[PDB]
Amino acid sequence: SAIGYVVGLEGERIRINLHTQPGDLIGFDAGNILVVARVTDQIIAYAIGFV
Amino acid sequence: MSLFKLTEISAIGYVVGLEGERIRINLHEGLQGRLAVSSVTQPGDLIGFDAGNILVVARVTDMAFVIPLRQIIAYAIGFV
């Protein structure tokens, strides 16, 4: 499944383009590393760490 | 044809515009692998441009869209 994709990066901010509320966590498949993010407010998210 | 060969360069893009301390770069798509070996695909990195006499050092700030096209914004900090 999926909820969207990434369209741009601005400093330390992530923009997600929709095809579910503040505080939820999301993940991005980057091959050898998985990146976890936190929703703050298209939606915006920040970064916390990697697994 | 003969022994002499000159060009050995591995670039990731070329300058497409200047707007008063603001640089736009269009990223190559035909490069199967940008390995020469360093990776610069993230804001906060350092890149350099060759101008024959000096090398200009810059810093990446933004990435965005618009086989789509990708763009990069950077700012200068000095030269070597």
């Binding site: 091959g31 050898n32 | 199967q32 070996v37």
Partner: protein, 390 residues
């Protein structure tokens, strides 16, 4: 132990690297005698050991009277069984030309023995060599996957894969026939098959179904030459009925300039023409842009292949992956004075200074079966037996 220019890598990075390489323009594979040992094959050391303890009554003549084999190599089991046959053929031809019966009768036994040992290890199925559907068995299970996920990966508009082989057994033909694809090897016809070099530039299309290429660098069991100065090809059953059956189950007989395996009769201008074409095609393919090469089962004991491979690394778009099992055992001998030419060559590539050579070592971790799994992924029987029941 996985190295890249002296560094080290883990499993996941290599598994991503192999996937990245498979999406290039040109892809090829080179096999050896070690890739057929899982189906009933043998190696050079094994065949030499079998020869030593079966015919010891004439091994002295090869060292004393004629000087074809070295004592140290014989004791250490490091002989090359390909050059010896060519030298024996030259000796027999000269003796026959000079009309020396005594020496002529001596050389018809050494060849009759050597061919007898060589041919036995290549049947791969005993007396079932003359039957049909031999590629449907479980022994030939991993050979099919290689073809299946080499053809599938290629996008529309891409070229066809290439397979280079040093074996002379029918391991890659039965599997391809049972899969349902066609291999181009340079022959055409049914009632009279002949060698046409220019068939290597053909491809299929649809009027409104895939293929590959197969180059044999040392010959095959189904190739021979008749009274007419042309090279023919036959099937397994016809070959067994014609000449293969008598070689194994008879005491002593020899034909002459008849067979084309393994690299035997190179002094005839009709038989060297077919050996030269494969080498020139390999050389032309190795020097193309955006190419990859996977090597498996190769002992690095051939002088010319090493020269060809080394000279092709002057270009930046040539990638090589090697599977050598006894890596550390070679480094230990390199530390001391002794060693061998193959070991010296292989250890040199380990100490290179660029990210193009990738050597993979270990124990069972680098065999043929392990190599197949690294490549990316791509009910009839019930209906068949139901119809047969009716």
């Amino acid at each position: 132990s996985i190295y890249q220019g002296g560094n080290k890598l883990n499993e996941d990075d290599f598994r991503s690297h192999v996937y990245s390489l498979c999406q290039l323009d040109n892809v090829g594979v080179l096999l050896g005698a070690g890739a057929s040992v899982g189906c009933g094959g043998k190696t050079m050391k094994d065949v030499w050991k079998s020869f030593k303890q079966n015919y010891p009554e004439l091994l002295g003549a090869l060292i004393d009277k004629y000087l074809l084999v070295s004592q140290i190599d014989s004791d250490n089991n490091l002989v090359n069984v390909e050059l010896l046959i060519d030298e024996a053929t030259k000796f027999l031809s000269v003796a026959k030309t000079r009309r020396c019966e005594d020496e002529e009768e001596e050389f018809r036994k050494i060849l009759s023995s050597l061919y007898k040992e060589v041919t036995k290890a290549a049947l791969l199925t005993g007396e079932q060599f003359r039957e049909k559907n031999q590629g449907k068995k479980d022994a030939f299970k991993y050979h099919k996957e290689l073809i299946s996920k080499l053809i599938s990966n290629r996008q529309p508009g891409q070229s066809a894969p290439a397979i280079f082989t040093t074996n002379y057994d029918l391991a890659l033909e039965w599997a391809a026939e049972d899969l349902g694809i066609q291999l181009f090897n340079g022959f055409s016809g049914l009632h009279t098959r002949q060698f046409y070099p220019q068939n290597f530039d053909l491809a299929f299309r649809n009027v409104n179904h895939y293929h590959a290429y197969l180059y044999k660098l040392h010959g095959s069991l189904t190739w021979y030459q008749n009274d007419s100065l042309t090279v023919n090809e036959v099937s397994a059953s016809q070959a067994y009925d014609e000449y293969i059956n008598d070689i194994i189950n008879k005491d002593d007989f020899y034909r002459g300039q008849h067979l084309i395996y393994p690299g035997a009769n190179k002094y005839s201008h009709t038989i060297g023409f077919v050996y030269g074409e494969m080498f020139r095609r390999f050389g032309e393919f190795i020097s193309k842009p955006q190419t990859a090469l996977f090597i498996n089962g190769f002992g690095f004991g051939d002088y010319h292949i090493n020269r060809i491979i080394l000279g092709a690394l002057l270009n930046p778009s040539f990638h090589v992956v090697i599977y050598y099992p006894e890596l550390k055992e070679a480094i230990t001998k390199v530390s001391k004075g002794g060693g061998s030419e193959a070991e010296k060559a292989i250890v040199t590539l380990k100490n290179m200074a660029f990210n193009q050579v990738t050597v993979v070592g270990g124990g069972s971790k680098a065999y043929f079966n392990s190599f197949v799994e690294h490549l990316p992924y791509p009910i009839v029987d019930e209906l068949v037996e139901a119809i047969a029941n009716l």
